[PDB]
Structure formats: C-alpha cells, structure tokens
C-alpha cells in the first residue's frame, strides 16, 4: 500500500455501499456483476473473472455451484462467495427461524 494504489473502477454509490435486494435470486443481469465487484473490493479477492458473471442473472447466481464458480474464481474465493450467497439465499427481509 503506502499510496500509489489504482484499483479498478468502484461501482456507482452516494458515499461507498452497494444497494441490493436481500434475496440474490432477486438480481438482475446488473446486480450480480454489482455484488460480485463489491465482494472482491471488500474481501480484497482476486483472480477472479468478474467476465463470467457478465450475464448471469441473480437466478443462475444462485444455482452455480463450488465447480461452475471455481471455473470462473479461485478455489478461496468459491468458499467466499458461496458462503456469502448461502445467507443471503436464506434471507428475504423475513424473521429468522428457530
């Protein structure tokens, strides 16, 4: 670090944050190219082909598994993202269960 840093283009944003639906089934050809920036800005990710993802709508989002995405990000960012994905999958502005 120490200056000298020229990331990528950040997404669009009032101050710095995503604005997505809880549910990722919910997204758009956009939003899963948006979240998926996002994750990778936060969780610092990297060799993973955002390209992949170009097109694919929150639905086909949702059932890529660790293999379609370890074929389009490392093996640590699959554990990452699915992770991720597995709440928010579970979560549609509902109470909890249990």
């Known amino acids: 670090g120490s200056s000298g840093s020229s990331g990528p283009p950040n997404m669009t944003t009032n101050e710095r944050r995503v604005i997505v639906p809880a549910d990722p089934t919910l997204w758009t ?14 969780y610092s990710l990297m060799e993973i082909d955002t390209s992949f993802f170009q097109n694919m709508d929150g639905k086909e989002l949702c059932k890529m598994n660790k293999e379609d995405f370890l074929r389009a990000t490392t093996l640590y960012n699959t554990e990452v993202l699915l992770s991720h994905l597995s709440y928010l999958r579970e979560s549609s502005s509902g109470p909890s269960s249990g």
Do not use: N
Request: without cysteine.
């Open 29 to 42: 050809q956009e939003h899963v190219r948006q979240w998926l920036e996002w994750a990778i800005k936060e």
